[PDB]
Design a binder for this molecule. Structure first.
Ligand SMILES: Nc1ncnc2c1ncn2[C@@H]1O[C@H](CSCC[C@H](N)C(=O)O)[C@@H](O)[C@H]1O
Ligand SMILES: Nc1ncnc2c1ncn2[C@@H]1O[C@H](CSCC[C@H](N)C(=O)O)[C@@H](O)[C@H]1O
Lengths: 258, 258
């Protein structure tokens, strides 16, 4: 049989909860915001490890997938960049002269985006109505980009997030949310059996970031199909208005119900 | 106070001991052996996480630090590439027409180097005398490159490794071993206190690789100064013949004693 590895860490010498994504983005920006400077490390709750280059968070508009390019060029009115990261999307809108605000729960991400020139509210999405300063919003356009629909989480979390966005939305507001329409890879079969034992929806993973001795919170993450997204929206304040594909990716337009 | 994060994994859904480095190198080679394809993730025994791009293991000679370039161009006779990885150094020697053998304990690394065209013995360094096939060696030149001296480990491990290399060495053989002469960064103070409590030498870390659900063995790793290396060699079959610096890096030439 296969031998489990056993965890790192001991009392006084172990990873601590904090803001590893902010640290990665800060290191990336400090080197010029290009590739081969800093790396995001994601750990799943079974310990599955995968990394990627953090330069993606600083990529200019011409390098974005078409679904993100479409969303940014259509943005109008008061824009909220939901989960802005290093601000690549909202920064493009600010350069174009629009009224843009980012929101992100990572203090370090917020600091990086602000340094690049984007106003950022530090808040969890579900804290938006409580944290939004008077005079900001209501918003005409919400950006949920960078597999943004995957950040919606489980149906319960998605409904609370969408409810929070509607609370700060202007009449007729839209969410421009992109996603991936891909089947679950076959090697995920064992992880999916674990999901079923725990009552968790098919296709979700529970993941966290790690960097140096810092660890982020567990959060739920998925690739949500356009049909899955339609089901999530039933009963919410939001109508699925259209779905636009670019190969594997899609851009969904959600409209606020009157 | 700061809150410890708590480990990932549960019975039946947790990381397993295996060959994560081989998996990373295989993914890198399968994409063309360039950057932005696959990433090495290193975890220290306190849980400290750092990643880097695995493309470095496929870099051509013109991209190597000068200390590695010097070593490879001086290699003569029967060469052993000690800890060959994806084989970048031995491959250059094989292309130049030399008799070269790699040795690596990662089966996947060995497979990658072999596919690129380098003969590789799968063995731990300390297993070289037992595993070396008759007719291979004795070796005139040993390459210990890519902060190779850092792989020597603690003094006890270093002495056993050097003893194993001498066992398969030709008369007058040399080890060409590179290293880093840098002070310990100040943020390592807490980790160094942990070393002292455990009787472990100043400047060492205990680290392992992680990739997907695989975890490598714990191994000891250090940046060994030229003076540290001289102390390690006292009593061994090896004399420190010369030290050549290129900025922060050095190339040490060790000569087999008669
Ligand atoms: N529940 C939540 N509330 C607020 N921010 C969140 C969040 N979940 C994730 N985030 C933030 O959303 C970002 C996701 S990374 C994507 C960033 C950006 N949309 C881009 O495409 O470049 C991270 O910066 C993370 O801190
Ligand atoms: N004790 C040991 N015995 C055999 N191989 C070892 C070893 N410790 C580390 N290695 C191998 O040595 C390699 C270190 S990475 C460096 C590879 C190569 N020298 C280069 O510079 O590109 C890894 O492939 C690892 O599997």
């Amino acid at each position: 049989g296969p031998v489990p590895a056993g965890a790192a860490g001991a009392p006084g010498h172990e990873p601590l909860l904090g803001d590893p994504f902010g640290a990665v983005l800060r290191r990336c920006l400090d080197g010029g915001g290009t590739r081969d400077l800093a790396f995001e490390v994601v750990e799943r709750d079974d310990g599955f490890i995968i990394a990627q280059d953090a330069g993606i968070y600083f990529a200019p508009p011409g390098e974005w997938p078409p679904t993100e390019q479409w969303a940014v060029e259509r943005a109008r009115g008061r824009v909220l960049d939901v989960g802005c990261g290093a601000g690549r999307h909202g920064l493009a809108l600010r350069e174009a002269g629009l009224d843009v605000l980012g929101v992100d729960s990572s203090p370090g991400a917020a600091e990086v985006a602000r340094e690049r020139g984007l106003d950022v509210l530090e808040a969890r999405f579900t804290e938006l109505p409580a944290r939004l300063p008077d005079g900001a919003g209501p918003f005409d356009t919400f950006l949920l980009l960078g597999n943004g629909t995957g950040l919606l989480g489980t149906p319960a979390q998605a409904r609370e997030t969408l409810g929070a966005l509607a609370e700060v939305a202007a009449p007729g507001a839209v969410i421009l949310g992109d996603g991936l329409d891909v089947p679950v890879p076959p090697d995920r079969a064992a992880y999916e059996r674990w999901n079923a034992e725990r009552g968790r929806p098919e296709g979700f993973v529970r993941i966290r970031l790690r960097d140096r001795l810092l660890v982020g919170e567990w959060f739920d993450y998925a690739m949500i199909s356009p049909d899955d997204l339609g089901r999530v929206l039933a009963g919410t304040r939001w109508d699925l208005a259209s779905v636009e594909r670019a190969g594997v990716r899609y851009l969904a337009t959600l409209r606020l119900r009157d």
